[model samples]
Target chain A: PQFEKIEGRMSVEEFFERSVGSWRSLRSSHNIAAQLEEVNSDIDITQVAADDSEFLDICKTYNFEPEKACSSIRMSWEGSSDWDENEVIKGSTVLVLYKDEERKGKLLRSVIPAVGEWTMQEDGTFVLHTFYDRAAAEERIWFATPDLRMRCSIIKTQHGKGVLTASLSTEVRDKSK
Target chain B: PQFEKIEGRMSVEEFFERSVGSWRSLRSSHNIAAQLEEVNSDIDITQVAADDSEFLDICKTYNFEPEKACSSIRMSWEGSSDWDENEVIKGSTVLVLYKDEERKGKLLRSVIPAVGEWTMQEDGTFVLHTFYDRAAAEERIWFATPDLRMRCSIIKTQHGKGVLTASLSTEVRDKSK
Candidate 1:
């Protein structure tokens, strides 16, 4: 029996429109919104979107043609604030690009390992915390030092979703300074 | 040691304004704009924001309170759809909700659910189909069979900060379906 080769051809735009998983969009835009509203007024929460302008800027700068936005857009995981105690920081930097739009057109696209060293942790855990907003991206690089990386990331409380809390090593490394 | 009860009072609106989480103003504004843009494209996604008249109107109508907004903010489970298998649908109804601004808002305040049934497969698996909208507190209920005894109801997806998948299922009948 002879096996036939599977040949397929589609532009990047077409590929995103057809291939990327739409689950994130389905849940994030709708479900997460409710969660935010249910919380109190004082809680300062933000939604890191998958947008078009951001995508185009990245593509144009990286020399890729403008294309449809299709990708599992995630917020930048760059800081130790969100990093668990099991994770350790190694003076890592991260490069992120994502889309913040929904329905139809291509909104996000990016290349992997985009020119940055993400601090890997003891448990093979790492993070690059960031928000697309300019100010958030400029914050200091906070992470867990090896000494403080022994604690687990899980914290259980009796309240709502028991606040999952972990303290990262306060070894603040100021990139700007 | 006995803890003292925290005491303070303010009008609902005043309390909400102060309780918005770390970035409530920004989050609410961004979400409202996103939703409005979804409902009406003429909306400039960027310009439709926190203090916009349209957004404020919608927020007030549904009693989009601040405590609900901040506490509602959370991260759903990443990776794998919650409905990977319909086994949980055996005694569940699908809940659905609309994003009020038609684009964005904190707490996804307008979720709705539909009454539905679950059918088990020969392989011991199941399939659940539901049509719910969050806006209708007690929607019009229709059943395949006249017996309302075996029915499903949908509810909110807000809880403490934990990562869990957003799947369709009515909560247990403990309280009263």
Candidate 2:
């Protein structure tokens, strides 16, 4: 009865207002983190975030060296975002993406060093191993949490790589399941 | 209600007898066909022979053509055969594959040439393709399928130019609404 009552009687009003409290006060969307938890269930969460640590850690999961950059990385999110985070940086980054939600098939986008702009390829998937110039490398922009703290991750660039490309992917819950 | 009567009344003894009868008839199990009548308000069931052309016309709804193929081809299914039907052939036959039921991700198989097996490369697409004879162009094999059968599509060999390949795929469903 309790399970049924909790499931059926839990109104959307209470879910957004009381259960989660004020949206403005929410720093990190725990639901997004929860979805990530489900996605990385086989993965050790602590080990998955090992690369984000300020200092090197002992256990290296996914065969990724803590200090070195991964040659290729695949990233996806289950949560929804109003703005395309990938598009914001598309001018400087190269990405090959397929969105079942927005665009049906793969839309490959990359930055051509000759004439730099947010350019898209007919087919999806691209090479974005571009190098970061001195200005972008030296400059570290700060992003603040809801609490307005200065603590955040700094973006850095590598020396030799051609395109400083990173991929961003989004995956919705398995709707059929 | 008739629905309740259909599902609710059978006893274990009756069920056991029916189950055994069903099991005996299992080897001869045939697919059911339904037809619309009177402006298509509802579907009416009808019995037909499995290999009968009329029944095959309905079954062909699930049939599909392979993308195409090369002069020589070989491949194998991975994991277990979760599929209801799969086939392998050499020489001058066209391959036909389609989803009899809905499936996720992709189906993969390895390909080996008739003359000499090429180096295998692990890939997720290119599971289907038509191959042409490199030298003579006389020994080409074509893959074929039915028109209304909508499920898996063709695999591009260029994508699988290397070794092992996977099929980029989708699903099929009966429209209720």
Candidate 3:
């Protein structure tokens, strides 16, 4: 038998690759002004080919090179929240990450509707800063262990004069299900 | 006697006010380039009066006005860390926070020899961004529940090109002692 371990110095691509599988994500979000909300989802993350058409198309549309868009992933998720108690939330999206020699990169464009920057922090934290017209969003995702990961997402008023909404999500890598 | 509840709308002052008391904090830090380290501390926080000389001195030494400095507090701490396991770290300091109408403001320079910004996020998270000659640091402090608080502190390269170190701390307030 062989034992597998995470050495704590995870590269950006390795993180995404290691996370390729099934997950149960539980979430809690607040509008700040309004207050409580909760949602839960089942997610599937897959690393797509570098030549994936949709990923390449997105690069072309955004005026970026597919080569520099080094990593591609497809995220599909479905959930139900307080806003849609009776309805199921479902969506499929793709991200083409562009990286250089280091842990920093551009996460395609309009991931929020388009542009964002993502960095694989030294402590194995993956952070995203996305820009919008009247607001800007930030998200931090990190693994507590191989079997558990946590996320915190936020939206702030232009220039961050005030915070608008934020959410916290925890995902467990379940092999039993 | 009465019981007070955190309405979740923690104004900048209220948050600091409620934080006044005693705590035991445990932390783990990574000097991203060197190695990961740990530290534990015993801390006492107090809300000081407007005329407190040390706080006023802080207002004058820094560029902020004593009148504008609405939040004044003193924190005394003792630490035992991996870097200095045999050496007991101790220090007492005062900060005068300046604010106008909301949860955004300027707090004292950090425990480090740095100056920066502090904000009580809309979500009750207290965040600080400090700067040094060749480094920049960020810390986030938030309440986990009634008697628990957590912290994450990070120091980045000169231009924040990358992180140099990060620490995560968990604090539990003890009434039995």
Best by lDDT: 3
How close is every model to the real structure, measured as TM-score? 0.18, 0.17, 0.51
**Which ten residues in a row are the worst by lDDT in model 2 chain B?**
B22-31
Q: Any idea how many clashes model 1 has?
A: 79
What lDDT tens digits, residue by residue, belong to model 3 across residues B1-177? Answer: 211125337777776787888998766665543455557789999988888888777776776677876778899999898787569989898866777448667777434355557766545667777777777776777765556666766566755455456565656676775
Sort by lDDT, top down from the best: 3, 1, 2
lDDT of 3 by residue, A1-177 (tens): 211125237888887877788888766565542444567799998888877877877888788878776677888899888677679999887877888557887887424246678877555668788877787777777765576666766666654455456565667776773
True contacts recovered per prediction:
0.00, 0.00, 0.00
Best by TM-score: 3
iRMS of every model, one decimal? 16.2, 16.5, 10.4
For each candidate in the order shown, give its overall lDDT on alpha carbons.
0.23, 0.20, 0.70
Could you tell me which residue pairs clash in candidate 3?
A109-A114, A110-A113, A110-A114, A110-A115, A111-A114
| Higher-TM-score candidate of 1 and 3 | 3
Flag the better candidate by lDDT, 2 or 3: 3
Q: Where's the lowest-lDDT run of ten residues in candidate 2 chain A?
A: A36-45
lDDT of 1 by residue, A37-128 (tens): 11111111122244545545566665645443233233332322222454433221212323332211222224332322222211222322
Q: For candidate 2, what is the total of clashing residue pairs?
A: 23
